[PDB]
Design a binder for this molecule. Structure first.
Ligand SMILES: [Ca+2]
Ligand SMILES: [Ca+2]
Ligand SMILES: [Ca+2]
Ligand SMILES: [Mg+2]
Length: 280
């Protein structure tokens, strides 16, 4: 079924996870390095690229930071695989790992630093598909033999489509991404989409709420730019991000149990190999 917002506070989600008996989880990070990032900051980031580095934090950095402050507990070893995608070296075909021989990030401090070290060495390209980052997360979950993971994707949300067409028919990047979201539901994987820039967000909301062919609701959408733009403290913006990020975790974790996915190896998950980072 489709999972509504069933928690109105951060504490409520805590308690549901407590009743759910969650003992173990890990995180995987995916970052959109597609070229749309250069204009999806028109309204929300002062006509600067969403990946532009300067004296002020860009929205990817804010997301990397807020994520580190709020969601940290959900990676049991503070060791996080990270992956870029959409850059010139992977296009809509591959991902690349943040580090040469697979090595993971030591906490989100490193994710922020490694992100800073990397993004201006990149050619932002495309097209935009989520199929490779999601298939990479699948391989990850499959190799740990069914250990529960949450995939956090930070992206401007503009998966490649055509403007008109209004067909309601899917581009190749739309079909491969949807086919991935459906395939991922045969594994203990939660997907969390952290959306930055101006949007529009109608596709991300479709991924969140309306993907009939999947076995359970495995996708959540977070409008980061909405949460940040609001009228309140920095504290309460972080609580709000965390509630939004975690809103579907308890149902989805229970689904991985009731659908027999947790700790179960699927056996039909193709082994995706990440590319090394295209950097120095
Ligand atoms: Ca981990
Ligand atoms: Ca959902
Ligand atoms: Ca939702
Ligand atoms: Mg794009």
């Amino acid at each position: 079924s489709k999972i509504s917002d069933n928690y109105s506070s951060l504490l409520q989600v805590s308690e549901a996870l407590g009743r759910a008996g969650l003992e173990s989880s890990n995180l995987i990070v995916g970052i959109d390095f597609t070229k749309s990032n250069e204009w999806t900051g028109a309204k929300s980031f002062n006509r600067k690229s969403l990946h532009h580095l300067s004296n002020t934090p860009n929205p990817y950095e804010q997301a990397i930071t807020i994520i580190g402050r709020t969601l940290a507990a959900f990676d049991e070893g503070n060791l996080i695989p990270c992956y870029g995608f959409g850059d010139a070296s992977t296009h809509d075909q591959d991902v690349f790992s943040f580090y040469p021989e697979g090595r993971f990030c030591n906490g989100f401090e490193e994710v922020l630093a490694r992100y800073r070290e990397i993004v201006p060495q990149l050619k932002l390209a495309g097209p935009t598909s989520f199929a490779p980052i999601i298939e990479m997360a699948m391989t990850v979950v499959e190799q740990s033999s069914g250990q529960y993971h949450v995939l956090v994707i930070i992206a401007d949300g503009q998966v490649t489509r055509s403007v008109d067409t209004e067909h309601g028919r899917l581009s190749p990047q739309e079909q491969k991404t949807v086919d991935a979201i459906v395939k991922a539901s045969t594994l203990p994987l939660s997907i969390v989409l952290v959306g930055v820039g101006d949007g529009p967000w109608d596709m991300m909301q479709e991924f969140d709420d309306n993907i009939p062919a999947r076995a359970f609701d495995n996708f959540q959408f977070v409008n980061f730019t909405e949460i940040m733009s609001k009228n309140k403290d920095q504290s309460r913006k972080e609580t709000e991000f965390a509630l939004s990020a975690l809103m579907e975790i308890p149902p989805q974790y229970k689904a991985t149990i009731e659908l027999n996915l947790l700790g179960v190896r699927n056996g039909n998950i193709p082994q995706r190999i990440p590319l090394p980072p295209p950097v120095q």
